Design a protein around this ligand. Structure first.
Ligand SMILES: Cc1cc(Oc2ccc(CC(=O)N3CCN(C)C(=O)C3)cc2)ccc1C#N
Length: 188
């Protein structure tokens, strides 16, 4: 077959019930996740190949960057609660990996302030139990799939993307192969 288990994707030994349709995991310390966001724009191209009525979910992970890694998972919960993911994703990536100006929770907060989120607005969200719940959801989703590496994408709680089995000759070709695989698994 053109799409084969173990080539473009793998099948989870224990599928996860009630999982988001398309679940994406990343870390702001993750180098390929940087490429996935700024160079390849994976999630955008995936969204454009899925049907218009399908939910896409992106979660941060703790297992990279120690203390700051957990701060960034809580900050991503704040971004999701305020709906400002598209304003802070790039400055958080570059603050961690390019300029290396993000070294504390205060530095993370500065990114939101510079992006236009008011100080009281950010601090209220940061300390809200709604964000506490959103951090728990990010943790449970990763723990449900025994996640130990990022970037990672899971389709319908049973299929995991395998970008290693795709062509990296051409970056545009890799993205389309990736997005077509998600669409194929979505229709499975
Ligand atoms: C064209 C291209 C293609 C790429 O392909 C990947 C993608 C993801 C991975 C997986 C990975 O990095 N992980 C997750 C699993 N584990 C256990 C880890 O430790 C680390 C590898 C190559 C990466 C970057 C670029 C670029 N520009």
């Amino acid at each position: 077959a053109q799409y084969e288990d173990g080539k473009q994707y793998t099948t989870l030994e224990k599928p996860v019930a009630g999982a988001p349709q398309v679940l994406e995991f990343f870390s702001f310390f993750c180098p390929h996740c940087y490429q996935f966001e700024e160079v390849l724009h994976i999630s955008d191209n995936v969204k454009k190949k899925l049907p218009e009525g399908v939910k896409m979910t992106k979660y941060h992970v703790n297992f990279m960057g120690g203390d700051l890694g957990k701060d960034l998972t809580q900050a991503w919960a704040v971004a999701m609660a305020l709906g400002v993911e598209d304003k802070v994703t790039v400055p958080l990536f570059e603050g961690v990996q390019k300029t290396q100006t993000i070294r504390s929770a205060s530095d993370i907060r500065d990114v939101f302030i510079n992006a236009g989120i008011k100080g009281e607005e950010y601090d209220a969200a940061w300390n809200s139990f709604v964000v506490k719940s959103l951090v728990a959801q990010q943790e449970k989703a990763a723990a449900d799939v025994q996640l130990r590496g990022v970037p990672a994408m899971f389709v319908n709680g049973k299929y995991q993307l395998n970008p290693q089995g795709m062509d990296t000759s051409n970056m545009d070709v890799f993205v389309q192969q990736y997005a077509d695989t998600v669409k194929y698994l979505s229709e499975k």
